[PDB]
Design a protein around this ligand. Sequence first.
Ligand SMILES: C[C@@H]1CN(S(C)(=O)=O)CCN1Cc1cc2c(=O)n(C)cc(-c3nc(Cl)cn3CC3CCOCC3)c2o1
Length: 126
Amino acid sequence: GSMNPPPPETSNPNKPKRQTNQLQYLLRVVLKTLWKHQFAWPFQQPVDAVKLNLPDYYKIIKTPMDMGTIKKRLENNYYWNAQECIQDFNTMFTNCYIYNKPGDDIVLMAEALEKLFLQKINELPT
Ligand SMILES: C[C@@H]1CN(S(C)(=O)=O)CCN1Cc1cc2c(=O)n(C)cc(-c3nc(Cl)cn3CC3CCOCC3)c2o1
């Protein structure tokens, strides 16, 4: 092993494939808008604690999450419901805010993405 955990699962081979209009919105509106933002890149994959030499990251973070994982989960129809996906986004942001120093560039980047996320979730269809 290494400092890095195995990445979260991204497919569920034993569930039915079922869309919902909220899951469609989460992929086509929410994820796609965040993914293309200029500050998305540090959130597009799991934190590589080995490469970045962050021995405490996965000691502090209990539930790793990132937008690459979320994207794959949505594209693979991993989620049974939209609330599971919203929870993953929230976990990603929480991880960033509880680990990092408040003034740091990475927290400014997270905040820009989070504002966008929360605005799109305010417009989540019924
Ligand atoms: C190496 C960084 C340096 N930054 S800083 C001073 O803000 O530039 C402090 C954090 N530290 C560890 C860390 C944490 C972290 C993270 O939560 N997340 C979510 C991501 C990263 C991360 N993933 C990649 Cl890929 C690069 N980085 C570092 C960021 C940093 C901001 O500028 C964009 C690149 C990540 O790294």
